[PDB]
Amino acid sequence: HLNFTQIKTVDELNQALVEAKGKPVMLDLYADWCVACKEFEKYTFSDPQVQKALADTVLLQANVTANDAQDVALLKHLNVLGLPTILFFDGQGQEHPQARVTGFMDAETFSAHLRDRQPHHH
């Protein structure tokens, strides 16, 4: 399983971005009842290719299973319309909306998607 850092609120995401400044970030939005989210874990995040590709990316996760007020605020703030959604932020903390993943992707497809991100080495 990937080693995600959990965030719950907008404030928490923003502080994680501040601390990640200098490395690219991936924010995975998850719920226990989200079938394609579980499929990401089974087929894609579990694949060494993907795991190694992500090794120099800070991985964040929001678990919105409850859909509580903080979850909803977070989704609204990110203009998320459904799950799964995966956002990508460059090493300056800027999100690139075209990089958003909003459906299941297998490991080869996801890997290719990672490759097409804004360059991120120093």
The yes or no reply on residue 68 touching Ni ion (CB under 5 A) is no
Which of Na ion, Ni ion, none lies near 94, with the C-beta cut-off 5 to 8 A by kind? none
List the one residue from 56, 68, 108, 116 that touches Ni ion (CB under 5 A).
56
List the one residue from 12, 99, 104, 106 that touches Na ion (CB under 5 A).
99
The yes or no reply on residue 108 touching Ni ion (CB under 5 A) is no
Least distance (Å) between residue 25 CB and Ni ion: 12
Q: Which of 32/56 has CB closer to Ni ion? A: 56
Cis peptide before 48 (omega within 30 of 0): no
Which of Na ion, Ni ion, none lies near 56, with the C-beta cut-off 5 to 8 A by kind? Ni ion
Which of Na ion, Ni ion, none lies near 99, with the C-beta cut-off 5 to 8 A by kind? Na ion
